[PDB]
Design a protein around this motif. Structure first.
Motif, PDB file in Angstrom:
ATOM      1  N   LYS B 101       2.881  -2.699 -10.255  1.00  0.00           N
ATOM      2  CA  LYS B 101       2.213  -3.902 -10.738  1.00  0.00           C
ATOM      3  C   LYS B 101       1.454  -3.682 -12.039  1.00  0.00           C
ATOM      4  O   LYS B 101       1.062  -4.666 -12.677  1.00  0.00           O
ATOM      5  CB  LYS B 101       1.256  -4.432  -9.667  1.00  0.00           C
ATOM      6  CG  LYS B 101       1.957  -5.042  -8.467  1.00  0.00           C
ATOM      7  CD  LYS B 101       0.965  -5.475  -7.407  1.00  0.00           C
ATOM      8  CE  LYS B 101       1.676  -5.946  -6.151  1.00  0.00           C
ATOM      9  NZ  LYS B 101       0.723  -6.212  -5.041  1.00  0.00           N
ATOM     10  N   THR B 102       1.238  -2.434 -12.446  1.00  0.00           N
ATOM     11  CA  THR B 102       0.534  -2.136 -13.689  1.00  0.00           C
ATOM     12  C   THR B 102       1.511  -1.962 -14.853  1.00  0.00           C
ATOM     13  O   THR B 102       1.396  -2.643 -15.876  1.00  0.00           O
ATOM     14  CB  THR B 102      -0.323  -0.876 -13.518  1.00  0.00           C
ATOM     15  OG1 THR B 102      -1.215  -1.052 -12.409  1.00  0.00           O
ATOM     16  CG2 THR B 102      -1.134  -0.596 -14.780  1.00  0.00           C
ATOM     17  N   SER B 103       2.474  -1.055 -14.704  1.00  0.00           N
ATOM     18  CA  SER B 103       3.454  -0.795 -15.748  1.00  0.00           C
ATOM     19  C   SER B 103       4.661  -1.720 -15.685  1.00  0.00           C
ATOM     20  O   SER B 103       5.393  -1.820 -16.673  1.00  0.00           O
ATOM     21  CB  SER B 103       3.940   0.654 -15.663  1.00  0.00           C
ATOM     22  OG  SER B 103       4.573   0.901 -14.419  1.00  0.00           O
ATOM     23  N   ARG B 104       4.879  -2.394 -14.556  1.00  0.00           N
ATOM     24  CA  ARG B 104       6.048  -3.242 -14.334  1.00  0.00           C
ATOM     25  C   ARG B 104       7.346  -2.438 -14.322  1.00  0.00           C
ATOM     26  O   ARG B 104       8.431  -3.004 -14.492  1.00  0.00           O
ATOM     27  CB  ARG B 104       6.133  -4.361 -15.378  1.00  0.00           C
ATOM     28  CG  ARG B 104       4.935  -5.311 -15.384  1.00  0.00           C
ATOM     29  CD  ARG B 104       4.690  -5.910 -14.006  1.00  0.00           C
ATOM     30  NE  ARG B 104       5.914  -6.447 -13.421  1.00  0.00           N
ATOM     31  CZ  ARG B 104       6.058  -6.771 -12.141  1.00  0.00           C
ATOM     32  NH1 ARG B 104       5.050  -6.613 -11.291  1.00  0.00           N
ATOM     33  NH2 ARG B 104       7.216  -7.247 -11.705  1.00  0.00           N
ATOM     34  N   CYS B 105       7.257  -1.128 -14.118  1.00  0.00           N
ATOM     35  CA  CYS B 105       8.433  -0.283 -13.969  1.00  0.00           C
ATOM     36  C   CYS B 105       8.772  -0.109 -12.494  1.00  0.00           C
ATOM     37  O   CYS B 105       7.903  -0.194 -11.621  1.00  0.00           O
ATOM     38  CB  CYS B 105       8.203   1.090 -14.605  1.00  0.00           C
ATOM     39  SG  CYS B 105       7.964   1.065 -16.396  1.00  0.00           S
ATOM     40  N   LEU B 106      10.050   0.131 -12.220  1.00  0.00           N
ATOM     41  CA  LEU B 106      10.472   0.426 -10.858  1.00  0.00           C
ATOM     42  C   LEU B 106       9.920   1.779 -10.426  1.00  0.00           C
ATOM     43  O   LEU B 106       9.879   2.732 -11.205  1.00  0.00           O
ATOM     44  CB  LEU B 106      11.997   0.424 -10.755  1.00  0.00           C
ATOM     45  CG  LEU B 106      12.699  -0.924 -10.944  1.00  0.00           C
ATOM     46  CD1 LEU B 106      14.210  -0.735 -11.023  1.00  0.00           C
ATOM     47  CD2 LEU B 106      12.345  -1.886  -9.824  1.00  0.00           C
ATOM     48  N   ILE B 107       9.482   1.853  -9.174  1.00  0.00           N
ATOM     49  CA  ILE B 107       8.947   3.083  -8.601  1.00  0.00           C
ATOM     50  C   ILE B 107      10.086   3.800  -7.887  1.00  0.00           C
ATOM     51  O   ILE B 107      10.517   3.380  -6.808  1.00  0.00           O
ATOM     52  CB  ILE B 107       7.782   2.794  -7.647  1.00  0.00           C
ATOM     53  CG1 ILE B 107       6.582   2.258  -8.435  1.00  0.00           C
ATOM     54  CG2 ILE B 107       7.422   4.048  -6.861  1.00  0.00           C
ATOM     55  CD1 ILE B 107       5.447   1.751  -7.569  1.00  0.00           C
ATOM     56  N   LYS B 108      10.577   4.886  -8.492  1.00  0.00           N
ATOM     57  CA  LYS B 108      11.677   5.659  -7.933  1.00  0.00           C
ATOM     58  C   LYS B 108      11.272   7.056  -7.484  1.00  0.00           C
ATOM     59  O   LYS B 108      12.091   7.751  -6.870  1.00  0.00           O
ATOM     60  CB  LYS B 108      12.815   5.779  -8.960  1.00  0.00           C
ATOM     61  CG  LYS B 108      13.351   4.448  -9.457  1.00  0.00           C
ATOM     62  CD  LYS B 108      14.542   4.644 -10.382  1.00  0.00           C
ATOM     63  CE  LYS B 108      15.035   3.320 -10.943  1.00  0.00           C
ATOM     64  NZ  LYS B 108      16.225   3.493 -11.823  1.00  0.00           N
ATOM     65  N   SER B 109      10.051   7.485  -7.766  1.00  0.00           N
ATOM     66  CA  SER B 109       9.618   8.830  -7.403  1.00  0.00           C
ATOM     67  C   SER B 109       9.433   8.939  -5.895  1.00  0.00           C
ATOM     68  O   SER B 109       8.673   8.152  -5.318  1.00  0.00           O
ATOM     69  CB  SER B 109       8.311   9.170  -8.118  1.00  0.00           C
ATOM     70  OG  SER B 109       7.803  10.418  -7.681  1.00  0.00           O
ATOM     71  N   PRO B 110      10.099   9.884  -5.218  1.00  0.00           N
ATOM     72  CA  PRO B 110       9.876  10.020  -3.767  1.00  0.00           C
ATOM     73  C   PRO B 110       8.416  10.215  -3.396  1.00  0.00           C
ATOM     74  O   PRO B 110       7.945   9.616  -2.421  1.00  0.00           O
ATOM     75  CB  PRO B 110      10.726  11.244  -3.397  1.00  0.00           C
ATOM     76  CG  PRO B 110      11.789  11.292  -4.434  1.00  0.00           C
ATOM     77  CD  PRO B 110      11.153  10.795  -5.702  1.00  0.00           C
TER      78      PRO B 110
END
Lengths: 409, 150, 421
Positions: B101-110
């Motif tokens: 919600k801050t960077s608007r990037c997808l979270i893919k890090s396990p």
């Protein structure tokens, strides 16, 4: 004083005896020195005069009653109409006229017929599974009344009472399927205060300033959107939707999911309250950008101030810095004592975020559990909440699940 | 082909459409066990047990999108539970990640996904839709869940 | 097998053929419907790749004089050209005759329905005839209108069916309201209103015909006829709802093949107070198919007073008739004499022209000049627009006993109430 005798008025016995025979419920609103209580079993309002006897009340009947259950009632900005809000429809009731020394409706008759008009009736019958998620009035006190409806199709539609079946404006925000993006759908919205905006914002010209209202839209996953609405200058199909507004600072839990309610406090810069079903309350400063961002100044956990229930947020008529939260455990009051420290020039650059961060480390809001509805067995949500605005001290009316009338302080 | 229609680009079957043709018997009936239909890069649907694919228009019935899947577009043209593709199945949807919600990037890090317990979020998203979560694979964002029917 | 009958009391009598559009380079293949007729006001609406053309109906009707070559095509006739930015595949008119719908495909933008107020065509003070409302089908290829029908009694109501299988019911007043829709997975192939216009019947890819209230709440399913096997599966190609329990239904190969030829099937339905099955009678290929290059399409219409059905087909140069019998229940093919038939001509390059649109005028007031000496009263006129751009009119002379004249005098169109863009 009505603060003393109102809990013993017969209208609550009537409503209570009607029990023996989802949207959050609010079956009460106030107007002048009168209290209006929706009687679901008779599809009418019970009107009690607070200012100027325990058995006296007027019944305002719907000439054409709603057949869907009414969950919320909402007085219009001009105070001539009441929205009757359900999951399966919305109906607008026109209040009758007053006359007589006591300013009773139609001279004090025991029963008064009120004209009603259904709204967006097509959408609720054509698509059987289409439901209403949130509704409010367009805030103007000058224009014809307009209602704003958010439906389960993730679309917001605005209707004039002059054409209650045809939207004046539509906002496409973008169940047969299995989906992972189940939270990418709007659950609530709230208008901010009046603002002057350049006419160029709506595609027209002249470098002239027009009236508009910011419309904040909350997704179930916690994302927020913003658009400015002008009933005169907005296009029929609004596409200038800003967001999701970036939420700063970065949070380890990403501010979770399961957001259920939003409130725009009437201040500049706007400040949003975002509530979650888990009892989290986020206080967000809207920082100007063309997309603005949110700075989460602080978070309040109601689970600690006493939890998986819907949370409902209420503005305070006196102070823009105070709001109230209703839930299955009762009512909380929240005072944002730091609102008055934020100036109107604030922006979204780095030095402003650092100043807001530094300020949040020396400022804290005041939270108080003012009314407890916790049972001895299954908790029940309240049915009504209203703040009677008196300059000598606001009086709060809370109607419990069993139609008990609690008054605070 | 002996009955089955599948032409949408990216879609495939296991066994392949060519293999299904040869499996068709003397009387023109295609019965296969543990059949899978998928769309490369978006997901797949695994049907454990025997199913009768004879004269099924898979182009019109099965639809696999990003974070979404549909089987039978309307309820009227849907067979009863247990027949056709309206039956128990295991759905896999790929590219399923939350957004920061801050960077608007997808979270893919396990590790980041374990921080926010995205797995528990997907368990809830499954139950709310009448499905049973099975597993989640961060590297590809693969959300596997079982459904009793469609 | 198929019931048939030499009919000497019906003839189609050709009027001169009239060129409307210029001959195309290639044979038009796609399903299309490009003729509409206002029988209230006496206008004909013709469309193609190349604009929309409106004529006073009587201008299109010219009788052969003795001496004249009945095969000579009149070159043009005065009407109005309304330029269109894209090609039109479907034209239709509302039951009050005041709304023309024009369906267009743009390769760039996909499909759009333009809606014209018919008075605008008569409005001398508008040099440009614009539609007053559009409806954009987000769809591109799957957005081709393949069937579209106005309600016979609710003037604002129209039913539209698209290539992707989706369907919608629209309300067109001063603007366009979507009242009901059904998504593509329903697999609609064709559409048709009940006579009084109280329900919608939709043909379907799976071979069934489902009935619906205009709200698209399902009311009755007509099953796929028992004679079709599982290894010869079919789809409704077109449907005509004649009476409450009576339909013409056309089946075609499910898979889209053009080689197999469609079956026109008459269907009689039981009632609530009957537990009979549905009676189907396969009349098969009453319009004999010479062409396997075009998308199938039967143009069907019922003429109650004559109790018969006119049928044309995209794959055929011939118009056929299915009449109800004296019986009053069953149907029979009418077999007409050689010089009394309705057939599209051979193009000058010696190919067959085929139908793109079919209508009947009932405003004709001229009497049929038979011999030098004999004259018959006015008859309805069948009009076909061909793939070659030629209009083909034929008087329909029904001399059967007891048939009452169907001619209806036309009215003047008043610009009052014209909708604006």
């Amino acid at each position: 004083l009505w603060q003393t005798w109102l809990p013993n008025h017969v209208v609550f016995l009537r409503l209570r005896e009607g029990l023996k025979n989802l949207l959050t419920r609010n079956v009460v609103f106030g107007l002048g020195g009168e209290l209006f209580l929706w009687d679901g079993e008779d599809s009418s309002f019970l009107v009690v005069r607070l200012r100027g006897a325990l058995s006296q009340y007027q019944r305002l009947l719907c000439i054409n009653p709603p057949l869907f259950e009414i969950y919320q009632v909402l007085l219009s900005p001009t105070q001539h109409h009441v929205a009757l809000i359900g999951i399966k429809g919305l109906m607008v009731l026109e209040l009758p006229k007053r006359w007589g020394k006591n300013s009773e409706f139609e001279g004090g008759k025991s029963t008064v017929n009120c004209s009603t008009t259904p709204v967006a009736e097509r959408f609720f019958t054509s698509s059987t599974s289409l439901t209403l998620k949130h509704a409010a009035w367009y805030p103007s006190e000058i224009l014809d009344p307009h209602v704003v409806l958010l439906t389960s199709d993730n679309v917001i539609r605005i209707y004039s009472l002059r054409e209650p079946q045809t939207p004046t404006n539509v906002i496409i925000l973008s169940g047969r399927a299995y989906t992972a993006s189940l939270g990418e759908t709007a659950v609530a919205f709230d208008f901010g205060p009046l603002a002057a905006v350049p006419k160029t914002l709506f595609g027209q010209n002249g470098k002239d300033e027009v009236v508009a209202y910011p419309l904040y839209i909350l997704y179930e996953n916690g994302e927020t959107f913003l658009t400015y609405i002008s009933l005169l200058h907005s296009p029929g199909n609004i596409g200038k939707l800003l967001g999701p507004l970036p939420m700063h600072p970065a949070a380890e839990d990403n501010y979770g999911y399961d957001a259920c309610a939003v409130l725009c406090l009437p201040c500049v810069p706007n400040i949003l309250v975002i509530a979650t079903e888990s009892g989290m309350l986020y206080h967000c400063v809207v920082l100007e950008g063309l997309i603005p961002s949110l700075y989460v100044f602080e978070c309040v956990e109601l689970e600690l101030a006493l939890f998986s229930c819907p949370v409902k947020l209420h503005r305070d008529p006196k102070c823009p810095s105070r709001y109230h939260c209703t839930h299955e455990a009762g009512v909380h009051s929240v005072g944002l004592t730091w609102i008055h420290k934020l100036h109107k020039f604030l922006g979204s650059d780095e030095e402003d975020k650092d100043s807001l961060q530094e300020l949040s480390t020396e400022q804290k809001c005041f939270v108080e559990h003012i009314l407890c509805t916790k049972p001895l067995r299954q908790p029940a949500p309240i049915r009504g909440f209203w703040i009677v605005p008196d300059i000598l001290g606001p009086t709060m009316i809370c109607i419990t699940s069993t139609y008990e009338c609690l008054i605070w302080p | 082909m002996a009955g089955i229609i599948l032409t949408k680009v990216g879609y495939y079957t296991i066994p392949s459409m060519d293999d299904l043709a040869k499996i068709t018997n003397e009387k023109g009936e295609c019965i296969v066990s543990d059949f899978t239909i998928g769309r490369k890069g978006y997901g797949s649907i695994y049907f454990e047990g025997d199913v009768n694919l004879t004269n099924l228009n898979l182009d019109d019935i099965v639809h696999i999108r990003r974070k979404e899947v549909v089987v039978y577009l309307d309820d009227n043209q849907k067979p009863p539970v247990g027949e056709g593709l309206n039956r128990k199945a295991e759905v896999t949807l790929d590219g399923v990640w939350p957004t920061d919600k801050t960077s608007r990037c997808l979270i893919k890090s396990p590790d980041r996904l374990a921080d926010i317990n995205y797995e528990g979020r997907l368990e809830a998203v499954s139950r709310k839709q009448g499905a049973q979560f099975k597993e989640y694979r961060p590297e590809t964002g693969s959300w596997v869940f079982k459904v009793s029917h469609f | 097998m198929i019931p048939e009958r030499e009919m000497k009391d019906f003839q189609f009598r050709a009027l001169k053929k009239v060129r409307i559009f210029d001959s195309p380079e290639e044979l038009p293949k796609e399903r299309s419907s490009l003729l509409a007729v206002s029988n209230k006001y006496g206008l004909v609406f013709a469309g193609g790749a190349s604009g929309l053309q409106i004529f006073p109906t009587k201008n299109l009707l010219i009788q052969n004089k003795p001496g004249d070559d009945p095969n000579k095509i009149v070159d043009k006739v005065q009407g109005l050209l309304v330029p269109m930015k894209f090609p039109i595949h479907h034209l239709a008119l509302s039951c009050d005759n005041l709304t023309l719908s024009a369906c267009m495909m743009s390769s760039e933008y996909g499909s759009i329905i333009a809606f014209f107020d018919v008075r605008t065509f008569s409005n001398e003070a508008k040099q440009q005839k614009r539609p007053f409302a559009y409806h954009k089908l987000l769809k591109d290829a799957g957005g081709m209108v393949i069937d579209m029908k106005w309600n016979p009694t609710v003037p604002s109501m129209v039913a539209v069916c698209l290539a992707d299988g989706s369907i919608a019911v629209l309300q067109v007043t001063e603007t366009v309201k979507v009242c009901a829709t059904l998504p593509s997975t329903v697999a609609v192939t064709s559409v048709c209103w009940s006579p009084k216009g109280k329900q919608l019947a939709v043909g379907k890819q799976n071979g069934t015909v489902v009935q619906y209230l205009p709200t698209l709440q399902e009311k009755k399913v007509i099953p796929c006829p028992p004679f079709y096997e599982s290894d010869h599966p079919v789809r409704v190609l077109d449907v005509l709802w004649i009476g409450t329990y009576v339909f013409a239904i056309v089946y075609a190969a499910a898979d889209g093949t053009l080689e197999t030829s469609p079956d026109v099937v008459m269907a009689l339905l039981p009632k609530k107070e009957e537990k009979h099955p549905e009676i189907f009678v396969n009349f098969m290929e009453p319009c004999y198919g010479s062409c396997t290059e075009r998308q199938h399409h039967y143009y069907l219409s019922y003429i109650e007073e004559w109790d018969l059905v006119l049928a044309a087909s995209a794959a055929s140069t011939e118009v056929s008739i299915l009449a109800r019998q004296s019986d009053q229940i069953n149907w029979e093919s009418w077999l007409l004499e050689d010089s009394s038939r309705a057939e599209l001509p051979v193009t000058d390059k010696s190919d067959d022209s085929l139908p793109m649109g079919v209508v009947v005028d009932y405003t004709n007031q001229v009497e049929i000049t038979i011999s030098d000496e004999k004259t018959l009263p006015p008859a309805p006129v069948l009009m076909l627009l061909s793939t070659d751009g030629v209009l083909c009119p034929f008087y329909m002379i029904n001399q059967n006993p007891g048939v009452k004249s169907l001619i209806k005098t036309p009215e003047r169109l008043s610009l009052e109430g014209e909708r604006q863009p």
